[PDB]
Amino acid sequence: HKQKVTQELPESTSFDVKGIEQEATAKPFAKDFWETHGETLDEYNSR
């Protein structure tokens, strides 16, 4: 008699959904002003 059970296995799949990635942590407004205008916020308002 033939064995009515096959080594063939059932298959499940992962709920892999990719949406839209996020923007990285934008620079702080103080550091933004620094490496763009070479001088901090305090040194800019003293004028």
């Binding site: 059932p10 298959e11 499940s12 799949t13 992962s14 709920f15 892999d16």
Partner: protein, 79 residues
């Protein structure tokens, strides 16, 4: 005329094996129809304990949704 009498039983045992694998396809078809009536905007439950039952499906077990759940995701991945 003994092999004929043997086939009368072997065919009965093959029809009882296409009865328990057409049930397990009826259940996935009705579960898909339930999900589709729920998606297209109609208020019918989709728990496996609230599908309809008509002797072509039998009572729904939990594993007849797992099977379905891994099979829509498998089909959506292939498009």
């Amino acid at each position: 005329e003994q092999v004929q009498n043997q086939m009368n039983a072997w065919t009965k045992a093959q029809a009882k094996a296409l009865d328990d694998s057409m049930k397990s396809m009826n259940k996935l078809d009705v579960i898909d129809k339930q999900f589709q009536k729920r998606i297209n905007g109609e208020w019918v439950s989709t728990d496996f304990k609230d599908m309809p039952v008509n002797e072509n499906t039998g009572e729904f077990k939990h594993s007849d949704m797992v099977n379905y759940a891994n099979k829509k995701l498998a089909e959506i991945d292939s498009m």
